[PDB]
Amino acid sequence: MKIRSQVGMVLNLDKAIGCHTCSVTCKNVWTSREGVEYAWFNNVETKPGQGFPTDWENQEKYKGGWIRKINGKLQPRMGNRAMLLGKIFANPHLPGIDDYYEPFDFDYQNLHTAPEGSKSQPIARPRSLITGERMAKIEKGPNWEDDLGGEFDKLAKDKNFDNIQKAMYSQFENTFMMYLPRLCEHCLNPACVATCPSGAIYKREEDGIVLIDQDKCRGWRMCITGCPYKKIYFNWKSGKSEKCIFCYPRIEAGQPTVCSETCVGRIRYLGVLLYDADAIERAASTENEKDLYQRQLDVFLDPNDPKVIEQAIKDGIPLSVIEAAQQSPVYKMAMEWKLALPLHPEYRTLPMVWYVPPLSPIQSAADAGELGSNGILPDVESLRIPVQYLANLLTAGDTKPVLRALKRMLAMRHYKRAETVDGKVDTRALEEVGLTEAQAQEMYRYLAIANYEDRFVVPSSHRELAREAFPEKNGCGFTFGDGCHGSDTKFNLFNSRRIDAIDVTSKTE
Amino acid sequence: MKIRSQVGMVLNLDKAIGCHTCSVTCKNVWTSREGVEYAWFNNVETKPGQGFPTDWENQEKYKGGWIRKINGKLQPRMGNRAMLLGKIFANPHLPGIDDYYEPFDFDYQNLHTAPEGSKSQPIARPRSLITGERMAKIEKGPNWEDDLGGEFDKLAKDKNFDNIQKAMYSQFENTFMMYLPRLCEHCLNPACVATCPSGAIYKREEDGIVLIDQDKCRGWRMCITGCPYKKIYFNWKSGKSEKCIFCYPRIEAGQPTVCSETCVGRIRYLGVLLYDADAIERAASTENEKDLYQRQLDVFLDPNDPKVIEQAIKDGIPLSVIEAAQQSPVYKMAMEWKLALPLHPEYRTLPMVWYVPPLSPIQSAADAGELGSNGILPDVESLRIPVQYLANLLTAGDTKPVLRALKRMLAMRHYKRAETVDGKVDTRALEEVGLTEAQAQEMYRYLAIANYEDRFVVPSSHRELAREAFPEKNGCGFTFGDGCHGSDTKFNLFNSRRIDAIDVTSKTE
Amino acid sequence: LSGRQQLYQDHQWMRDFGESLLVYRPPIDTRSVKEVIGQKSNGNQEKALNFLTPHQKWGIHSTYSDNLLMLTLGRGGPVVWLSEADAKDLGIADNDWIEVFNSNGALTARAVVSQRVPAGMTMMYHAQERIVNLPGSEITQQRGGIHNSVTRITPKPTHMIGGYAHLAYGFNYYGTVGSNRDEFVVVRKMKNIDWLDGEGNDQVQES
Amino acid sequence: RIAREFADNADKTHGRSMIIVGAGLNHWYHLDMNYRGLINMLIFCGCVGQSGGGWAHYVGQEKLRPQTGWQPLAFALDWQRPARHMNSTSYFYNHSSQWRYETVTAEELLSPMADKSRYTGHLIDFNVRAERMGWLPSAPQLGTNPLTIAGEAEKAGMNPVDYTVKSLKEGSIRFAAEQPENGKNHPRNLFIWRSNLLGSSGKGHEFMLKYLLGTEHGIQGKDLGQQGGVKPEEVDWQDNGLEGKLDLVVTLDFRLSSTCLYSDIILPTATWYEKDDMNTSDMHPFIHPLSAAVDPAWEAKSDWEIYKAIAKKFSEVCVGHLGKETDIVTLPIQHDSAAELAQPLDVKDWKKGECDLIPGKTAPHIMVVERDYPATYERFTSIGPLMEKIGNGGKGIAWNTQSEMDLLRKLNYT
Amino acid sequence: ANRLKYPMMRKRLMKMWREAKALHSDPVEAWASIIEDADKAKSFKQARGRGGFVRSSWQEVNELIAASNVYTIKNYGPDRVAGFSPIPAMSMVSYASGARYLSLIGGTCLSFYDWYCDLPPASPQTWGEQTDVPESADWYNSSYIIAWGSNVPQTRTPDAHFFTEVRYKGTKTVAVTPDYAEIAKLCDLWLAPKQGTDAAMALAMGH
Ligand SMILES: Nc1nc2c(c(=O)[nH]1)N[C@@H](/C(S)=C(/S)[C@H](O)COP(=O)(O)OP(=O)(O)OC[C@H]1O[C@@H](n3cnc4c(=O)[nH]c(N)nc43)[C@H](O)[C@@H]1O)C=N2
Ligand SMILES: Nc1nc2c(c(=O)[nH]1)N[C@H]1C(S)=C(S)[C@@H](COP(=O)(O)OP(=O)(O)OC[C@H]3O[C@@H](n4cnc5c(=O)[nH]c(N)nc54)[C@H](O)[C@@H]3O)O[C@H]1N2
Ligand code: SF4
């Protein structure tokens, strides 16, 4: 039993509007440099589709995540330590730039400088940001499949259509589409950390954010294959890999991530989750992959349980973090209401960015239909998005937890309609799904009204703990180049001293 | 004729409350590091007094500023190039740490950790920030003379009491005191730039801010002596010198300096001044030092003069800078109303931070006095602060320009009182000082009401001009350590490339 | 009582204590000096002075008083302002360690000698407190006290009046007040500067 | 010249002459004469009440603008009325025993036309008399545990109020101020926060250390008893005064102040940059907030959270010791209440038989307050029912605030 | 270096508290065993201001505090528990926190305006009002101002500009202070009456 904390995230796909605002803000702040222009730490994909990079969910092809060997031990799908090292001279599974898209720009200046007497109206043609050469045509982009862009037979190659008779969905009347925004899952059992030969990737103890040390990374580019979500992008210029940093500079002071605060649909929630680090391997190595979801819930600890609280304090968790954990919207959605589910738990990484499945228009039928258990509102069985597709995406193929989430959302709607339209109390739907009026009202508070203070409950990462914040406050930022940052040993060849430190020791004790 | 622009500053000493807020904010932002803890880029001094460092105005002692040789040529008081180099092994005029004060801290932790059974109440004693040793007593500080702290005979050593029979001022009834806040003057003919053997100090072309290049400075510590205002402070730890940077990071986007925006008394004004750089040497080398003030005014150009405007554009001054110059409060106070005067123009540096002299309570007299030219309000002749003292401080001993400034301020008061109390128009006082009703009303607008937009009229330094702002916007701040910043040649031993630049050249022209 | 601005205070106590109408009243005699002056001589001249405690420039009361920025811009700790005449009379130089005391207690601090302080009065700006840069007291043999170590509460009967229209109780509306400017103290230059901390870093001010 | 100019200006502008005054004048013993002097000047020139003119007294930040909105929260008036307010100068004069060293006599302050025989006694005697006449508040109030009075009243066959009045007249129950050193009439637990009482405002510092704290002190003079002076006629006297009265001193601060240095327990509180709150002042008309830039560092907590937690622990620790109790609370005659019309023509002391003991007129109001100790936390964390049952008000006026409580149920939840 | 980071308790008190809890399961009774023992009580009271602070925990201090409060209220009375906090206007809820807890349990809430001597009894006497004054902006509407015993630039720093600026509108200003205070620097005339005798000057002016 070793308690650690992390700010998890929940995205309500039912409220998702697939606008990509989250992607643009992240891009502007973190990846507008040459080398990562093609990398979208946060990217939104329209489903059905193969995504970015193409077919990233196909682990047989990309070799991401973990496998559970016959002896019960975990091993990266990429191979054990020796197998992985044997692939270092040329990663055989590495995604190529074309699996993402060839980054491009346009010759806008031609519009300004076109010479007098041009035979035709000047135009701005595409040019490659990789070679600087003219591109005859743009054939791919990071969001090429947006809103079912492409023939169904192409989009339907979607890994999540596995075990589903998808023919019926190629019919106009049965058309369906949803949005899947995603970033790094900042896993409890990250496959990236395990597949980096240099040990440059690590999970921060205090807030669970997973980072690639830009000093220590040696550019072995094996981690890219290791990540089953393909959320690590090689910086082709620096020769090192980069990934979503969960906006730690903001999180550290209690602010939401950029993609969370800028989410226009108001579908992202941030809240602390306390977990038992000592149970990570046991949970991730459970025999049946359909048990990974529940096994992970079992690693999450009850923040209102004095036993957990006292253990947390003993393990160094700050009081403000424990407090935040007690009013975590993420804990309520994943643990209490069972509305949020992990993304591909079968990869065995114990992801920390979860999703509430989306509702959808009722399916095509013979007639206009009849009043169901929910009156004029939909019954879970009538939704047009095949539940098996959602289960392949969130619960390793088990439709049970997906149906529960969807039914509970619809139940809340039924209950609230009786209240706001009929002015009556009708808990029939809630009782059918095991929800109390109090739970439905709280669900409504967080999901419908969704006040800012309720969507984001991020505590400080307390940078003052175990460090020296005073000298840092006084001297951080003066980047003159003292050459003494980044090492604990004081000796340095350039005979310098840290600008933000105190060299003259107190002699009065 | 070569026009350049600079954001000058004017401090209204008549509104000065000597609060030091300006000093604290600057300190917190720029000089809280070990090495410069004793340095106050902005410091406030109570006069009469010797200041910080002690007796800084005594150039015979400190050797700051310029001298005009018999042949009419200018030479740093420190010596010509050879003379200065001959002093490099040990600057004979260098101010010692004790001329400032020995920086100290206190053992606050003793209050927390004192052991049980202490014989007396624990206390926090002083300790040196230079040696870390216990200090028996604090004997000096940067503002030791605050509010006439010290015997008159000591304070009166004040250089500005030269040529004044000061005995009468040692009498209680004749007591007087004023405040002199100051920073670097960012001179047009800086003595610091001229006295640095490495050429590490320079005046920025676009905004006239004077800086010490932290890369290029070699720590010759000659500039410290060169500056007659002693506004350059040696960083005893880094071994390099630092000085007020006129908050260029803020000025660059059109914001006021920290000490300007945080000035509680609302006495600081920021406005553009256009100057003819080609006339700098001619002005600074005028034979009579009492002519330096007017000679400098002659270097300032009329921003509403189409001749100047067209020349400015030809010389590269941005349109927004010219526009700002046309509504500059600094230009109005120095050029139009003649209220602002330079600080020690006799140093021949052509300072760019000017001051409006302070009014004061009437002097001691035989009786309660009679109505003067200004009615119940003071006549310039009755002010208790000796005008000769103010002239020694601002006009090389010439009382004429000081009397004009003071009389005009009092005239505005007389005119406004007639208006607001008697409800009548009385321009008698204005006519006596050569002011029109319109000028008095504008003076009132800027000095009395002093709206934020009127106190600070700072244009952008236009960082996009002659540079590449696009790649910079996209990649500045990612301080991973590319080792390619600071040089124009691309070759670098570590075989790296700039993070905020584009390496892949366009091949489509 | 009258509904108007009341110039006349007709309450029994107001009348009998002589304040039905405003009248001039000289500073009260706290009798805090004559019983202790010269009783614990350290060899240096002692003198009685009015002890004023106007509010300081290097803190808001005692808040910020321990703040290094304020201590650096001020005089590095507890100080007391004296006129040049009084300081010279007592053989006190600027920044000398001095001790101020009376029947109520004693305090230690450094002097700030200035012409702007009129003879007869001393000003120890309000609150520099008791945690920073204070040596032991030669009067008490304990850590030096603070400005309120030399004051004592003395209520005024007219401030106890109640049950009378405008003169009726209210939290913070009426009641006795903590006046303190009438206080007088004995001032003198310190001789032995013992810090009572076992550091063996004590001083002696000569003559 | 100045008196003339000042008046001439006021005449010409219809009162636009102003006097900014502060502690330079207000901290003298005769502050009232200093102020009435300036006030008369302003009144004679018709400056009070006219923009640009008047009495401009500036000292501390006493103007909390949303007064009647804050009062119920601060003193739990939404749950119980009244609270126990006390005027501190008399409180400290008494408990830190500074009266034991008084050098000033009322006699030397009397008008020469006053009957000296009618004003005998120590200055503290005047305070005790003021207290029993309902002029000033008391603390502690009575010489007997006020939670036990209702019980005794029941056994006597009379309501607590009548029983208290009868006991006071007879002397079976006495005002605690009469015997401040008997061992049961002094404060025992003191919370200090947002204050440096022992390093700043505490006049008579050494007296507080000796009598309140029980530590070494630097008092140099002798007390009345040692000087053989005249002992008070309303207060008991003992040559060796009771020392170390406070059993527990708890201070909340973000820096180790002088008060913290002398406390028994120091609680780390959040700085102004680590918590939410509001601030107003006499100087300007804006209300703005204190906000948490970052969660409080280390183990610090805001004052609100510190007391909420103490209230929570108290609520569980008190079980079996304190339950639903009945408290007898004295309350002085309040200005801005009909009772302010107490004694119209003179002063009558009921203890001297000059009049009957009539609570709320010739003595303090005697109120009954029910306290649910186990429910302290639940009450602390909720807006009480009195706002809806009784209403809200202040400065002599009251109003219905039901609509506001309805709004609050929606904003704060229930 | 002077930031308070953890709840602290005097070592002697902690030692006895923990030993008491080892013999008394109920904390109220543990407190009783300490406080009712003259030797024990005296052992930690005399340690006040003499070092020995040790790190405790919120749980420990909260229990001791609650237990002490219950014991005191139960055996002596709720008004034997008190709290001192001033000027709620600077942090309304922060003041309310302790005042609310105390008021609910019957503890005494101590005043401050009178105690600090900021209350001008002359105000209730003349107007039946604690204190109500014009805002600083209103100084700008005045054409004649006397700063009497008020050091504006130093003690009213953020508002001082209204005073310096109104002078440009033709307003005359007078400083009345015994010393050459900062305020004098801003005025047209400096009058220096002997400190404490101001009422005399006011009376003559009224005359
Ligand atoms: N002889 C003489 N005696 C006089 C006076 C005089 O002129 N002469 N002046 C009076 C007057 S006018 C005043 S206003 C008092 O000194 C004010 O004293 P106080 O202790 O409240 O302020 P101070 O600033 O010292 O106390 C503030 C303390 O609170 C801490 N603090 C500040 N903010 C908070 C907060 O939000 N929460 C908590 N828990 N603590 C906080 C602060 O660190 C300091 O220790 C008084 N006596
Ligand atoms: N910087 C700073 N500002 C503060 C405070 C602080 O501690 N520091 N505290 C605030 C608070 S709570 C208060 S109560 C105020 C107090 O501030 P003020 O009301 O300004 O009070 P004082 O500082 O006591 O007195 C002001 C000045 O009057 C003069 N003076 C002294 N004695 C006399 C006298 O007998 N007659 C006359 N005519 N003048 C005299 C002195 O020059 C003295 O500095 O400041 C408030 N603002
Ligand atoms: S989702 Fe993030 S933490 Fe998880 S394996 Fe991929 S890069 Fe690593």
Ligand code: SF4
């Ligand atoms: S958490 Fe921050 S770095 Fe990660 S995807 Fe969102 S915006 Fe980008």
Ligand code: SF4
């Ligand atoms: S004032 Fe500034 S620019 Fe002028 S000489 Fe000194 S350091 Fe150089």
Ligand code: SF4
């Ligand atoms: S301009 Fe900026 S750097 Fe210079 S003194 Fe002011 S605040 Fe300091």
Ligand code: F3S
């Ligand atoms: S494998 Fe490791 S070395 Fe860098 S490229 Fe990936 S983090």
Ligand code: F3S
């Ligand atoms: S797609 Fe739009 S709805 Fe939010 S998750 Fe991204 S900003």
Ligand code: F3S
């Ligand atoms: S002389 Fe030049 S080398 Fe540096 S220390 Fe001064 S700028």
Ligand code: F3S
């Ligand atoms: S002393 Fe104060 S008045 Fe302005 S110039 Fe500095 S902030």
Ligand SMILES: [Mo+6]
């Ligand atoms: Mo005050």
